[PDB]
Design a protein around this ligand. Sequence first.
Ligand SMILES: O=C(N[C@@H](COC(=O)[C@H](CO)NC(=O)c1cccc(O)c1O)C(=O)O)c1cccc(O)c1O
Ligand SMILES: [Fe+3]
Length: 287
Amino acid sequence: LPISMSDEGDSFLVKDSLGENKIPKNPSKVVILDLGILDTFDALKLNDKVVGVPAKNLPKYLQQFKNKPSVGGVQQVDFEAINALKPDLIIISGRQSKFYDKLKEIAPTLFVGLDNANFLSSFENNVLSVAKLYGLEKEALEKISDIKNEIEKAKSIVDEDKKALIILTNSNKISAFGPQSRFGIIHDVLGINAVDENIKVGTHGKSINSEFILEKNPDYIFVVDRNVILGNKERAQGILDNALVAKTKAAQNKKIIYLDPEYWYLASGNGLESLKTMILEIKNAVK
Ligand SMILES: O=C(N[C@@H](COC(=O)[C@H](CO)NC(=O)c1cccc(O)c1O)C(=O)O)c1cccc(O)c1O
Ligand SMILES: [Fe+3]
């Protein structure tokens, strides 16, 4: 699972859950397909090292990278463009793991996946491994610390008697997510209790309907609207505008929280600034 590195000493020998690579120190031509780790490059002052980004899925908080060469999207990866750039490192997360062999023929390929069962330790390991490549451990540790302090401030205000349900909307369908899922940080790190701790985890979640939401009667509903990312016309607010949901504590107290999908769905959890924004977004919704 974790990334491990030995100094060798114009490069590191690096092992991660997908394989092994010789990575040069201070790489100067990096193609990044994980949006969180791209934000981390910004935070570490490594902008000039980046030579390709998935411009098709570039969110509002990463527009300083809008003039970098495009390598397509996080799903629609453009291999010819990657190859034409002649990168010295490619950095990927779980969306691209199915392209690993093809990517690794072009250049050493680092996997920075987030472990849903161990979010914080994977986050730390991803960030510190990237910073090791550049001799920036001290800086990265200080910014990791600030994240921990933000986490403690958020936890401080959580009402231990209330419960939340996490849902994803897509076209007209609703699915639910719980602890240890792709959104589990809400329960697992920030301390917010779940209406159902036993939701089977899966990439796009457990299928449910409004009767189920009413039955659980959450105090907070956290909504990730995938429609926004795919450019469908439907919106979670429409799907949830019905009599079953309306009866819930969440609806009555206006605690149906539409989380920014450019952070939560595109999944920029590896970012030293973007993870802080997510933590703030939760905190401010429940304080
Ligand atoms: O519509 C998309 N993908 C297809 C096909 O998706 C996949 O290849 C698989 C599911 O078949 N998805 C992933 O592997 C995946 C992995 C991590 C996080 C994800 O959101 C994922 O979708 C689908 O859901 O049918 C899509 C477009 C942009 C961003 C996404 O996250 C998407 O899921
Ligand atoms: Fe997806």
